[PDB]
Structures are given as structure tokens and as C-alpha cells.
């Protein structure tokens, strides 16, 4: 009969990389929220120059974790130190496999004693649920999936609404809503604020700003209050088209491949994951090609989570991470793509004589799979890194990507990103026929700041 | 107190053009349907090379018109001849004002005796509703609005679902669903077909438009996609969908020519203050302080052949007085690909004070009425470009325009792309500078035309 878990899918599908690079899943969608409210350029501009409302209600998985062993479950599975962790502090939860590779990540809120909520993409939520169900933990779990990618006019519901108020004028909007001064608490500390007489819990995700959430039913009331108060300061809502491009400027890589496709110690997990999970059904896109799925894995140090690793508690993969030498690991950078090469990519769309054009680079977000992997090359043609999230900033007037590259490459080095896939493109439904191009890219800081080439 | 009709809005709103060109309404949205199912390039390609399912359920107003005087109401307001019109034939309804200017258009289905339904944009439905109410007609009307632009996850409902199966393999898919041979009905005649045991009414567009009660939408959709998989049929999302008309030649967006004239004052005093006409937007480079310079008459947008003086109709006297031979003509403008490359290159220029107006793909409109000036080599306004985007099938940017009648096919003109002084206050407009784009006058529906050279560029 047909598979019911990921292990059976892999045992049937041939080479794992070939299966994922030709998946028919289609685009990774940021659902439900209007694609644009004004236009994505003005919306990008506003978060740097005035204020914005980000609507985060629909594109992330929420996992509510309650019970006596809830903290134990988190401690056992995260690289992060649990020491001194008290309610009203959030952490960027990063779990690794027994082999030291990143499964995923999200934000875990310590809400009350024995009460936590994870927010992020599916993979780290899947890992938490597996260990909660099979590891003998005394916990209760409520899974609230991200909203359907194409709801078709059907109704949509979540447990909570989730917004951010950001931009240089964000604190003015927040204080106007609050009705008084509000202390700028420390990064990732949680407090509360008033909105139209409601007690609204907050998270410092600062130009300071806040993330706020509440029961789904008060979404419109909260939203209307924020937009009305924000008008004086030029606050505008951001649509789903501009929304995900924000991370190109801030430097968080959303899309590491869940490193769970190989390894005897991960087999029981592969047998637990359903055949229609994110991990079985998703796609890999881009120019980086290897026949071994392990070559797509990253460890925490390679994508900026090195400083989170704390060998002060027992956790899955701790021995693997202790054996890593942090000083030689690849490092997360921003690649600043050459504007002349970008013009050449778009020009090929309007070339009526050419046999092929370069891969369409959508704006402001150019990803065409849920895991992105473009090869980064030096001037000799060696593969020196992997570019993992790609798009464009109207603030910078530059195409940008987030990448992990060999540690010895200095800031300001001109590399190339291989943009597009081989042999006319894979069979992904996001991929039109196209030829590859080497794009020149200057290694830049993360978060992005402008860098001289030299 | 909020106003309740358009005349109040105009009397308080300053210059009418300035009001409409700075409207805060935002984008003209094709709502509800997923923006993409595969990607818009493959979707465009499939309607010329395999088969597609267009989903038309949500972006048009439906106006059902029933009763003894239903046909008389249509005949009294359309330029079209009613002769030979009987149930199971559709027409492209085109009403003009008493001054001979186009209000709008859409398809009217003659469903049965005394039973009609109009499908299209709001303006012609509004006009029909006004005359149904004030003209002394024995008719009942049911208005079913297009879906909200941003439903916010709230549920949506229409009276009917409405699809098209199109492309070179469309009839193969149609017959596989039918269970046998199906006759190629004549253009715009209506019949029926089988879909999953249901009797589905059809309209000939070489493919079909089909419709049915809203509750059977997913049953119909699933059967179409399942049967079409054999022939490479795929669904088209809302991003690619509206660019189809760039290739086929229909201008969707004439300005409803109702803003001036004493004979239209009573209509303005009835139109709601939040109507399409009151709240919408005009975008583009064509600038005049006189709203009437944005009006078109039916000859200018391809509807000249529809005008028949065999019946009484609003605007008959005005249209009689027009010389069809001296009127502007509908064409396709093929935009120069090097000028397009330059438009997109400016987005990646970190040093320029300004960039050219963003050209979204595959549809570039940023208002519900579009009006870009078309210029000759001397800079005379010789036309108006009215719908703009790009075809992956042609690897070309295209616009639909109406231009001076004497301008030959193959002539190179320019379209002024973008707005003046950094751009209007429309929420779709980022700061930008204008660019003159070279464009070759081509036939409609579009076909590739060789450029024709003149002494120092075509002028006059
Ligand atoms: N609900 C919520 N969940 C989320 C996101 C969100 O937006 N809100 N966005 C994603 C997480 N993105 C980031 C980006 C940056 C940081 C960050 O800045 N972390 C600190 C360390 C945090 C810690 O001490 O644990 C640092 O110094 O890098 C954290 C999550 C996924 N899940
Ligand atoms: N439901 C439905 N309604 C619609 C559209 C649709 O897609 N389906 N699309 C829009 C109308 N578009 C066209 C395009 C071409 C023609 C057309 O081809 N007309 C014939 C004449 C038809 C007649 O005899 O009156 C001609 O010779 O030009 C008609 C409507 C709006 N209304």
C-alpha cells in the first residue's frame, strides 16, 4: 500500500536530492494576508522610514506546550541554555539532530510556569511533537498549523493573531496606543501594553518595536486601533508580497533544510513523520547540486547560531557540537548582488531572439522552493558557500541574498552566485525553462550594510 | 454626514481629474483566486500550447435581469442590434451615454424568455440598474457584486461559479468531460455539456466558457482538472489571468463617461458615493484638466462594427453625428524590449536620484482606469494607451491603445510611461521619473509586425 511515513517515501523514491529538487509542491506561500495594501515598494520603504504593521497571523506554525515536563522537553532538545530562563522571556529555540545539524528554529515564549508556545516553520514543531509523544514526557500539546496556502474562499481560523509594529516611528505609535510611556525592555523580554482597553502581551523584537499577540477574536479590534493611532505617524500595513523580504535586511535565514533524511539515530523519527509532512512533500531549489542530501545540511555555527550553543545542560547533539571547531566553520553573510548582472537577468525576458532567458527573479522575493540552495563560487570556480534566501530591497536598491560561506573570505570580496538551475531547470512547477547565470556578489555584513568591493 | 451620491462627491471634490488621478483606492484587484498555481510564465504558456482552466468566478459583477420588459431595457440602452437575438445567444452589450461615449461593456446571456444576465465590470451594471429603476420598465433585477478585493480570510459567496477551458487542447478536454463528441457551436452561441453527471451550460469563445450554481464549483473544478491532466491542462491564477486580454485584444477599462453633461446629472445624483465611478482611480501619463478628454466612443475601442441604427437607443443621435472614418482605432502597441530592459535596470541603480515607474509582471496597470499618452515623433498626443503588461508567449511587453486613424501599422510611436512630478498620490505609485518608450503599432489581436521607418519618425 501507499506510504504513511517519510521513511517509506524515501525507501521508494530513489535518490533523495533528486526527489526533493523535482517536487511538484509549488511555491512556498505566505498565505491569507493581502499580497499588497498599497504597493510593496512603499511598504518596504515604510519600515525603514516611518512605521509598519506586520501581520504574522497566518504563515507560521504555533505549538502550545503545557505540563510538568514542558521545560524539560525544551531543555533536552535545544542548543540554548535553559539556565535562568523564567516566564516572560522568549528564546530563539534551535534544535539539532544527534549528528549536530540544524532541524529548524523558531521563537519559544515562556508564557507562564509549565506553559510555552513555539512559533515558526513546521520542522522544529514536528521535532517537538515527536519527542513529546514518544519520549515519555508529561506534557500536553496543541498544534495550530499555518493557514492553507490557497484557501479558495473558504474560512480561515487561528488560535491567536500576531502582529509586529516596527520602524523608526514605531515607539511613538506604541506609546500613543498605550496611553503612557512604555519602557523599552531588553531584547526578547516579554511584557504588556494597553490597546483600546485590552491587556496585550508584548515581545521586544526591536529602532525598537514590538511583537504583540492575542486571542483570534480580537484581531479586527486590535488591528483597527493600531491603524487609526498610527495614521499620524504614517504607519501603513504591509502585505504578504513585501512581508518576507524583510529578513534579507535583518539577516535571519528562514529555510535551512531539516537535516533528518539520513542517519540510523533519525530512523524512528523518519518513521513517525507522515508521508505528507513538510519534510516529505517539500522542494529544494537552486543551482547547488550534490547527490548526497547531507551536503545540504547546516550546523548551528554556519547560520549564525554559534553564540547560542551552551554546554551547560544535556541536549540532543551536544557531543557532535562539542567536536566542532567554531573558528573554522562557515559563516553567515549577506551577498550584495551586482546591479548590472540583475539588469541582464531581467533584460533577457524581453529578448525575442534568444534561445533561452535567465531564471525569472521575482520581486521583492525571488525564492522558488521552500529550501533554497544556490552555489557560491570564488574566482577560481571553487564552491565556497551556499546562498539560501534571495530577493530585493527597495531601501537599498539592491538584490540581496543570505548565504553561508567559507570563514576565511573577507568582507568586500566579490564572489559569484550561480543563479538558475541546470539543464533547462528542474521539474518544479515554479521553474520556467531557463539558462544559468553567474551573478557577481559582494560579501557584506549581516544585518546588511553597504560594503566597498576592492 | 457622509455623501450619498456621486454628484455630491464631485461638487465637493475639486477638479474631477485631479480627484480620480489621486484616489486612495489602491490597486484594481482580481480577488480570491490564488495568485499562482504553478507560476505565471508557465500559466501563460499553457493557454497557447496546451490547455488552461481560467477561474472567472470572482472578478466580475453579475446582474440578472428578468421580466416582460427585460429585452426592451437592453435594446433601449445598447448600440447593438436586437435583431435575431433569442435565448442561448450572448452579445457583447455596449451602452453609450446621450453624448455617444462608452459607459462600459460586458457579456449579456439570453438565458431564456424574459431572462438575462449581464457579466462585466460595475459601470454598465450600474447603468442598467438606473434605467431599470427610473425608466418605466417591468423588470426585476438581482445584483451580485464582484468579490471583495481583500476578504481577509472571511468567507466569499457568488450566485454562480464561472470557468473557461481554453487553449489548443481545450476541445479534447471538453469532449473527454462530455463523454463523446461535442458540436463546435458558433461564436457566442450557448448550449450544454456533461461534467461529472451535471448538465452544464456553455458559451462558445477554440474553447468554452461554462457556469453553474455556486454550490457545485469544486465538483466541477475537480472533474476538469482530473480529466485535463491527460492533455497538460493546468489552472491559471489571478496574477497571469488578466494579462490574457493583452494577447486577445479586449480593452477592459474605458472610463465611464458619466462625469459631465446635464443629460447625465440625474444619473450622477443616483450613483452611490462609494460607487466604482466615485471612488476609483485614473493612472498614467495622459494629463488634462478636462475629464472629457479621457472619454472614448465605441468606434475608438473596436466596437464600431456593433453600432446598428435599426432601433432606438440612448446616444443614437450622438452616434449618428460621428464620422466613423475619422475616429481613433484600437491597436496593440509592441513595447521596445531595450526600453523595457532600461526600465527594469533603473531599479538596481544605487546612485540615481530616481528610477522609472515600476512595471509589474505580467500586468503593469496601477489604477482601474489606465491612460498613458501616445506621442508621435513631434511629441503630439496621437493616442491613449489603456491596458499594459507582458506576454511570456511573445517575450514582449504589450499595451492596448486607441490611436489616430491615419497612423499605419508598423509605425513606431512612443508611450510616455509613468506619471509627472514624481507621481500622483495614488497608493500604487512609488516615486519615479517618466520614460518615453518606443512602441510599434501592431494588429489586434496581437501579431508581430515589422517596424516601418519614416523620415525623422512619424509625425502629424
Ligand atoms: N513569534 C515569532 N516567531 C518567529 C518569528 C517572529 O518574528 N515572531 N520569525 C522567525 C524567527 N526569527 C528570528 C530572527 C532573529 C532572532 C534574534 O535576534 N535572536 C537573538 C537571540 C535570541 C535568544 O536569546 O534566544 C540573537 O541575538 O540573534 C530571533 C528569531 C521564526 N519564528
Ligand atoms: N461571462 C463573461 N463576461 C465577460 C467576459 C468574459 O470573459 N466572460 N470578459 C469581458 C468581455 N470581453 C469580451 C471580449 C471579446 C468579445 C467579442 O468577441 N465580441 C464579438 C461580438 C459579440 C457579439 O456578437 O455581440 C466581436 O466580434 O468582437 C466580447 C466580450 C467582460 N465580460
UniProtKB/Swiss-Prot annotation, chain B:
InterPro entries registered for this protein in UniProt: GCV_T_N, GcvT/YgfZ/DmdA, TrmE/GcvT_dom1
Catalyzed reaction equations: vanillate + (6S)-5,6,7,8-tetrahydrofolate = (6S)-5-methyl-5,6,7,8-tetrahydrofolate + 3,4-dihydroxybenzoate; 3-O-methylgallate + (6S)-5,6,7,8-tetrahydrofolate = 3,4,5-trihydroxybenzoate + (6S)-5-methyl-5,6,7,8-tetrahydrofolate
pH dependence of this protein's activity: Optimum pH is 8 with vanillate as substrate.
Positions contributing to substrate binding: 30, 59, 121, 241-244
Pathway entry: Secondary metabolite metabolism; lignin degradation
GO MF entries: methyltransferase activity
Temperature dependence: Optimum temperature is 30 degrees Celsius with vanillate as substrate.
GO biological process, one term: methylation
Cell inner membrane as UniProt keyword: no
EC number: 2.1.1.341
Site (Important for activity): residue numbering on this chain: 59, 241
Keyword Transcription part of the UniProt annotation: no
Residue positions binding (6S)-5,6,7,8-tetrahydrofolate: 56, 92, 119, 164, 209, 250
Similarity annotation: Belongs to the GcvT family.
Protein task: Involved in the catabolism of vanillate and syringate. Catalyzes the transfer of a methyl moiety from vanillate or 3-O-methylgallate (3MGA) to tetrahydrofolate, forming protocatechuate (PCA) or gallate, respectively, and methyl-tetrahydrofolate. Has similar activities with both substrates. Cannot use syringate. Uses an ordered, sequential kinetic mechanism.
Subunit structure: Homodimer.
UniProt protein name: Vanillate/3-O-methylgallate O-demethylase
Species name: Sphingobium sp. (strain NBRC 103272 / SYK-6)
Gene: ligM
Amino acid at each position: 500500500s501507499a506510504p504513511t511515513n517519510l521513511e517509506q517515501v524515501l525507501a521508494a523514491g530513489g535518490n533523495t536530492v533528486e526527489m526533493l529538487r523535482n517536487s511538484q509542491i509549488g511555491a512556498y506561500v505566505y498565505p491569507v494576508v493581502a499580497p499588497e495594501f498599497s504597493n510593496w515598494r512603499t511598504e518596504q520603504w515604510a519600515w525603514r522610514n516611518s512605521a509598519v504593521l506586520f501581520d504574522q497571523t497566518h504563515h507560521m506554525v504555533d505549538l502550545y506546550i503545557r505540563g510538568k515536563d514542558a521545560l524539560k522537553l525544551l531543555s533536552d532538545t535545544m542548543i540554548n541554555s535553559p539556565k535562568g530562563w523564567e516566564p516572560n522571556k522568549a528564546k530563539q529555540y534551535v534544535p539539532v539532530t544527534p549528528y549536530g545539524h540544524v532541524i529548524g528554529d523558531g521563537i519559544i515564549f515562556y508564557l507562564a510556569e509549565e506553559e510555552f508556545v513555539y512559533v515558526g516553520r513546521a520542522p522544529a514543531a514536528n521535532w517537538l511533537m515527536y519527542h513529546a509523544q514518544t519520549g515519555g514526557y508529561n506534557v500536553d500539546i496543541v498544534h495550530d498549523d499555518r493557514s492553507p496556502s490557497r484557501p479558495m474562499g473558504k474560512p480561515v481560523q487561528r488560535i491567536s493573531w500576531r502582529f509586529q509594529i516596527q520602524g523608526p516611528k514605531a515607539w511613538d505609535v506604541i506609546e500613543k496606543l498605550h496611553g503612557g510611556t512604555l519602557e523599552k525592555l531588553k531584547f526578547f523580554n516579554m511584557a504588556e501594553m494597553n490597546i483600546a482597553g485590552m491587556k496585550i502581551r508584548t515581545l521586544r523584537h526591536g529602532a525598537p518595536g514590538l511583537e504583540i499577540w492575542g486571542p483570534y477574536e480580537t484581531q479586527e479590534k486590535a488591528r483597527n486601533a493600531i491603524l487609526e493611532a498610527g495614521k499620524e505617524f504614517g504607519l501603513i500595513p504591509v502585505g504578504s508580497r513585501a512581508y518576507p523580504s524583510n529578513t534579507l535586511e535583518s539577516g535571519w535565514i528562514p529555510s535551512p533544510l531539516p537535516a533528518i533524511y539520513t542517519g540510523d539515530k533519525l530512523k524512528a523519527y523518519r518513521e513517525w513523520l507522515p508521508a505528507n509532512s513538510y519534510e516529505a512533500s517539500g522542494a529544494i531549489g537552486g543551482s547547488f547540486v550534490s547527490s548526497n542530501i547531507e551536503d545540504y545540511y547546516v550546523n548551528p555555527y554556519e547560520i549564525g547560531y554559534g553564540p547560542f550553543v551552551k554546554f551547560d545542560h544535556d541536549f540532543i547533539g551536544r557531543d557532535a557540537l562539542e567536536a566542532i571547531d567554531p573558528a573554522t566553520q562557515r559563516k553567515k553573510v549577506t551577498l550584495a548582488w551586482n546591479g548590472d548582472d540583475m539588469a541582464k537577468i531581467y533584460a533577457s525576458l524581453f529578448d525575442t531572439e534568444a534561445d533561452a532567458h535567465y531564471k525569472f527573479f521575482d520581486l521583492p522575493l525571488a525564492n522558488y522552493a521552500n529550501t533554497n540552495a544556490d552555489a557560491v563560487l570564488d574566482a577560481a570556480g571553487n564552491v565556497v558557500g551556499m546562498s539560501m534566501f534571495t530577493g530585493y530591497s527597495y531601501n537599498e536598491k539592491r538584490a540581496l541574498s543570505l548565504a553561508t560561506i567559507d570563514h576565511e573570505i573577507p568582507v568586500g570580496t566579490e564572489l559569484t552566485v550561480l543563479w538558475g538551475e541546470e539543464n533547462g531547470g528542474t521539474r518544479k512547477t515554479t521553474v520556467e525553462p531557463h539558462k544559468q547565470m553567474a551573478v557577481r556578489a559582494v560579501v557584506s555584513p549581516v544585518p546588511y550594510s553597504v560594503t566597498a568591493r576592492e
